[PDB]
Design a protein around this ligand. Sequence first.
Ligand SMILES: CN1CCN(C(=O)c2ccc(Nc3ncc4c(n3)-c3ccc(Cl)cc3C(c3c(F)cccc3F)=NC4)cc2)CC1
Length: 268
Amino acid sequence: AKRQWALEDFEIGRPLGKGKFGNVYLAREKQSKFILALKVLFKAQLEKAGVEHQLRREVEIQSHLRHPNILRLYGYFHDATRVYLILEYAPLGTVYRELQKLSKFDEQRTATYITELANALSYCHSKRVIHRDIKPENLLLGSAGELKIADFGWSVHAPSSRRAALCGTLDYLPPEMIEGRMHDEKVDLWSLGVLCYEFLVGKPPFEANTYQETYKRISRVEFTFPDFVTEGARDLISRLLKHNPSQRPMLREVLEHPWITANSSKPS
Ligand SMILES: CN1CCN(C(=O)c2ccc(Nc3ncc4c(n3)-c3ccc(Cl)cc3C(c3c(F)cccc3F)=NC4)cc2)CC1
């Protein structure tokens, strides 16, 4: 006799954004006045796009994860024409918007994000959840500025025009996935390397003018740092962006890396 959710349970307020397949609203649960983000998906659009499967998979995985740096799915329900996801509201919005605003983050902000991300991924891997999307546009910020990995990235339009895709997003694809090799939890360490670089620099490390060059840069691991990137950061990013997934660090080594601990001092 779990909770049967119904639309009637919520007061809906201002739109927070348009998705590919519907909209997200600021909402309150009526009795409690608790604030949350209500995501509405239109079944006819889900069907047209062939994405129901993505939605059942994530809802299943997501309903079972509880971690302060993973955006919580509190529940879901549907009617004849709509699916509703009752999601944690992150008041500070996306990390991507904040990176656009600032162009790049400092070392403390970056290293603190990486700690949060490493903790969340390490929790995911302990539940056999692998290959999480941690692109900036899929990271939200709580009221204390804590990072939250968002659910259901495929339901939101990719940035502006900047990101190109293939079997996923080109800029974040690891070499093992583009040389058709087997892939495992070690993809998440590659992602973390790309993200750390993007945080510090303001663009991802293999960004190129064509789509085939971006691909060659990844497979060859051709990246360089702007002069302002400090040696501890270069060291971490270089350890994360190893061509061979096996030589990528464990998440615990990321968490105890001296650059991370010098710059991420917030008690976990
Ligand atoms: C006062 N202003 C300040 C500026 N604002 C924001 O930028 C902003 C945007 C969103 C939020 N918070 C928030 N929290 C949770 C979620 C969303 N958005 C939200 C809003 C719109 C859309 Cl389209 C998606 C999502 C996603 C979400 C997702 F499901 C996948 C990937 C990325 C996401 F943000 N998850 C749920 C807060 C501020 C608007 C309000």
